[PDB]
Amino acid sequence: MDDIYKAAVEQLTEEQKNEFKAAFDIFVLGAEDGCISTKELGKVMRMLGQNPTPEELQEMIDEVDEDGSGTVDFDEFLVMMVRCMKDDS
């Protein structure tokens, strides 16, 4: 169902989206579709002023890797953002 997120995803406007979609062109700037991996991640991070490793990066996909896909499609991604922002810990 994941409706609690729908509303959230509905809240976001074309504005916050754009700025976001843009980053979407970096995470999967070398992916077939829109799935992110520990390899792509480090790519963005590095451009965000962060230079992590492949061991700590995987922990980023793991969470979103609820389907054990190994990567982060265009769905789980946005969610992971609304999961912390509107519920960090």
């Binding site: 700025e19 843009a22 980053a23 062109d25 970096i26 963005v44 965000l48 002023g49 962060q50």
Partner: peptide
């Protein structure tokens, strides 16, 4: 604590020139 703004950096031209 996804600042978000940090991303804008990776999406600021991305070598468009």
């Amino acid at each position: 604590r996804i600042s978000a703004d940090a991303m804008m950096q990776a999406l600021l031209g991305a070598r468009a020139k």
